[PDB]
Point group: D2
């Protein structure tokens, strides 16, 4: 199930000395896409007592991106636990909407932060998925 | 004279622990705007033997930007020398198009890179300004 | 087998609005550690016709880092193929040398870049591992 | 008067497609140096009700830095007002301690943040300077 599609313009300063987007920056793109998805659901990250924490990131690099470009990040529902969710991702560009530039996943766990303890996934996400 | 207006979306990761865009990032926004202006003029930065080099950056911070936001960078023609140009800038947001969030300038000098020597400003810029 | 230990100071600007190092930045730390390992082996990344390309990154986030801190990145030899190597990593801090802050791996493939084709791993790495 | 000397290792990912440190990153180096100076004075930036805010940054780029390198940031006392201080800077490298790679200043104003109003510079800084 597709949860969210984000369009993330590439900045010239995102490139490294290889002259393509630096490999680190793809994780910022993925972060931006999740933040936008969270925003659509009123999860604002703005110092809430409970919210999603990244446990694990996996990314496979398949094709480089070169400025100027707009990266398209598709987020898909992976497995939902009581307090965790796997968000699967695929990355394309606007000019190359069917090329897969990279893919992977982000495992999120919902935690009450001041307490360091897992808490249930919000109703909105259960509703979206389930 | 207004040379270029760029729209630069703010990324959540652009913020620092103060919860506003980190002061360093405004220079990336200014860089992106100049790169876009250069692109409109076919100055591609893509390893040309000659091109613009930043000599000096000045920026005055007036109002913070908080995600989500789109920064609007206006570039104005400052003083043009035989091989240098002052690009004056003003920064607003899309939601606050008349608030000045920051302002300053970037002095550019055209140089042949392998030689470290100043060269004339391209005709396109002289034409645009003059 | 431990291949390399890098010490990577944390910069204040590495933190995000959560007030810990931004999750993206751990990949820069891992990149810096690999670049330093490569440097010890005279793999300079400086535009060589052949060299290592990141195929995949996996990282598990276990404990946050807060500025000021020095991240310690340990790189271990994972599985070696004819033209690929898995570099396994563990992350600690100088003050907490036995806490595991994160762990994962980076799969590298050696490729001739202008040709997009896999090439053998350098003798130095085979020698180090084997 | 020299207030502080910081040593800031350059990271490979600090470089852009020109193959030198990206011009934006010098401002991060300057930020790191000020944060370290502030730390020596027990100004911790960690959510204090009052503290220094950057009003203006000026930097002149004189020589590029190429990885690997350690940037040396020297901070000097410029003019002290009742609630502002100009911190003048000069940038060198460890290998080139007398080459000036860049120079400029950062104007800081002390402000109570929740109120947006200038407040006196801390005794420690007046003592250091005066
Ligand atoms: Cl595109
Ligand atoms: Cl906006
Ligand atoms: Cl530490
Ligand atoms: Cl050095």
């Amino acid at each position: 199930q597709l949860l969210h599609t984000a369009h993330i313009p590439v900045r010239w300063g995102d490139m490294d000395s290889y002259g393509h987007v630096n490999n680190t920056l793809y994780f910022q793109y993925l972060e931006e896409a999740r933040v936008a998805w969270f925003e659509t659901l009123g999860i604002d990250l703005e110092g809430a007592a409970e919210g999603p924490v990244v446990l694990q990131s996996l990314h496979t690099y398949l094709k480089p991106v070169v400025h100027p470009a707009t990266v398209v990040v598709e987020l898909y529902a992976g497995r939902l636990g009581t307090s965790s969710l796997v968000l699967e991702h695929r990355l394309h560009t606007l000019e190359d909407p069917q090329g897969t530039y990279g893919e992977g996943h982000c495992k999120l766990v919902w935690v009450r932060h001041a307490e360091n303890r897992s808490t249930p996934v919000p109703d909105s996400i259960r509703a979206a998925i389930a």
